[PDB]
């Protein structure tokens, strides 16, 4: 299977699966079963904002997601990626529906990526920003329902011509270049991303969510991956 | 045929081809016969300096190239680069040796693209920055003889096991993902590349020279355009 | 008298002192006579973007203002700023209104200056960017009527509690560190400098306007200079 | 007194003051007895980097001090420094002698800061890099010792004109611009440093170390802050 790290912003409850009784952001390491979660007010129809910090020293993976009005949601987990990524992955964005829906669209996405090395100077980065989606987005691998040039956005699942968001759908957007995550010889292997969402559920309860993610290059939506497993999983091992 | 933009570091006068009657820096629009050159003390075996700017607002190329002592070598050309490259680009470095050799070893590389549209906010960017090549270096696209890893450095033609230059070696290295250099949308693009080179040929008779290009996105090195041609361009013309 | 350099967005056609006749952007060169001008459709009401970019290689110091519909005006000329500004400066916006008004609205301001010398990898930066401002910012020096805070953003000009734009207004904000915005020794100086604004003006015809500037670091409002001098100049030469 | 983070290269262990019994990398919240030292193996007359690094989410500050030679000192300490710092502040670098002595050397300086808001896209961001100090450089505040232009660094503490560090001195420089640390309704404030330095003690017995810092805006070096106290603080409490 691939490895996963992921920030997911987990917009439904799937306690069959470990999922805490609300919506919650949470750090997905090789596991759709967060090992750390926080409560979060996913506000229906507004703009969100996630951001993920990690740096190499610290060792620290940290998330927070917060809306204009302030209400924000913020985990971190102590994790040694070098111990987890390959050396070499893709990141990405996440996101599905089920049973229940939303959209999930992203309006902007950045990545910074930055492998300093001992030798003096010796800095490696990578940063990409995009605030504006084409149709033709060449930088972006688009997998599964993910589109974009749809608003200058990144729909990641099903909407239709009206924004009516589709059920089981997933999807998600790569970038491009494979991302130096971590290197044997590095001081400081650090990455942060930031992307704005667009969560907007006409159900009951809005599903399923949107993750940030660190894979394998060669990552793949898993086949069944819709609903609770956010196109990370295979399953909820 | 490729479309090529260049910056051409050019160590070596084939005035048979337009080259001025010394070592040159050079703009190159889809021709190896720049638009514009500026004679360039080629200073064998120091690390230089190149600049490449471009702004899609100013309509000016610029390119300098420097070496620690002070020395310098600066071109400019006015071109819109809209009417001359796709949307859609990837950059790299190119080198060539024929009957005359030197290192093309580049030892850092940066890139900065920006797309900045009219909607308020929503640039688009890239950046990479390369001071360590490392033997297995995904983001990069490595053509002809170009390899990287030793010394932390890309050589992009062939060195003998003991950094010694060949002859008659090409080699291009780009990065890997598309670059959106324009697009009809924006406002303003503007990209930049900086790179550090050594070129040391061990009897002071250095060919052929260092480019910065930007082509379409499957470019390939043309057949022989080791030589004068820089693995640029597949004649003369 | 203060050294000026600025890109004026220029909301009031002053032709006794040279203005063109309509709303234009424009390059001051130690004078409010524009050495270049183009053509502006300031959009009252709406927010406007400006870019401004310079590299000491191409020696074009350029500027575009744009509003989200996609109309836009560009102005470029070519300088050599090295012969025209002090070797440090400071950078701001400045704006005035006089017998016509309009708000002179900062939403943000960003900054980027380099200064890259020959020695290999020595770089020099500052970076700014402000996409809120604070009651108390400290890292911006007020003139004038200059307020912060104010829907966290930068009122250039006096603004009545309702938002109602006054006359005879004149207000900067420099930013507070000095800027090394060229050295002997530099390969390339370059800064770019963006800021987005909103220009409402209740009256006829809006006025006067909104420049970013670069000045020698001590400079303060010229006494009288409200309206078309833009809070820049002492007089019209 | 003035409120100081800091991290320390600590290259003269004061057992007397709570340092352990080598030379040490250490993060000083208020006071110059580290919360969280780690064995620092000091490579005399080498250039090594130290980078510093904190986020608000994660709450953790981290610093890493290397050589080229990949030997390398960590330390991380959770620490909220908005319970801390006050809410706008200088950063810096400091470097004491006392009996004994070394070059405190700065070849580089590095810095961002980010206050990433609730509003949506509302970073406030800072960013320097001095990799060339020059001898009138404005953007520095230079405080006791400390010089700037001899051969493009800055000498945080006395060099005789031989290049031969003085005793009791102490040199700090300082960002000429307040930095918005922190402020409550952001959901980030991220700062990260990085500097190189050149540490050399012409018998291999050094003192007293540099340490990055950052206080209130009008911190200054307390009175008889050589040695030990690193220019930090004005007793060892
Ligand atoms: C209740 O059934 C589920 O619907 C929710 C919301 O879609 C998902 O969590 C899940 O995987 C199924 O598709
Ligand atoms: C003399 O033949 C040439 O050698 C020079 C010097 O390398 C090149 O410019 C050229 O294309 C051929 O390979
Ligand atoms: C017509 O009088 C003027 O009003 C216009 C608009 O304010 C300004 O250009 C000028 O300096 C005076 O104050
Ligand atoms: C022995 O006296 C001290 O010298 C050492 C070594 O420099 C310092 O740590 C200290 O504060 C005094 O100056
Ligand atoms: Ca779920
Ligand atoms: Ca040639
Ligand atoms: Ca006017
Ligand atoms: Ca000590
Ligand atoms: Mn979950
Ligand atoms: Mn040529
Ligand atoms: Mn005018
Ligand atoms: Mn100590």
Redesign the interface.
């Given at each position: 299977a691939d490895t996963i790290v992921a920030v997911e912003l987990d917009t439904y409850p799937n306690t069959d699966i470990g999922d805490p009784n609300y919506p919650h952001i949470g750090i997905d390491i090789k596991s759709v079963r967060s090992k750390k979660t926080a409560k979060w007010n996913m506000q229906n129809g507004k703009?969100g904002?996630a951001?993920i910090?990690y740096?190499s020293?610290?060792?620290?993976?940290?998330?927070?997601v917060?809306?204009?009005?302030?209400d924000?949601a913020?985990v971190?987990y102590d994790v040694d990626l070098d111990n987890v990524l390959p050396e070499?992955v893709r990141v990405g964005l996440s996101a599905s529906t089920g049973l229940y829906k939303e959209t999930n669209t992203i309006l902007?996405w950045?990545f910074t990526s930055k492998?300093?090395?001992?030798?003096?100077?010796?800095?490696?980065?990578?940063?990409?920003?995009?605030?504006?989606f084409?149709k033709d987005?060449?930088?972006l691998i688009l997998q599964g329902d993910a589109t974009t040039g749809t608003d200058?956005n990144l729909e990641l699942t099903r909407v239709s011509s009206n924004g009516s968001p589709q059920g089981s759908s997933v999807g998600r957007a790569l970038?491009?270049?494979?991302?130096?995550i971590w290197?044997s010889?590095a001081?400081?292997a650090?990455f942060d991303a930031?992307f704005?969402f667009l969560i907007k559920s006409p159900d009951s309860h809005p599903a399923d969510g949107i993750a940030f993610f660190i894979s394998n290059?060669d990552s793949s939506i898993p086949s069944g991956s819709t609903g609770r497993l956010l196109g990370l999983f295979p399953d909820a091992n």
């Open positions: 703009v904002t951001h910090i740096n020293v610290g060792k620290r993976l940290s998330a927070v917060s809306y204009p009005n302030g924000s913020t971190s070499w902007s950045s492998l300093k090395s001992n030798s003096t100077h010796e800095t490696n980065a990578l940063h990409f920003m995009f605030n504006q084409s987005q060449k930088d200058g970038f491009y270049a494979p991302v130096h290197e010889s001081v400081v650090s930031t704005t290059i």
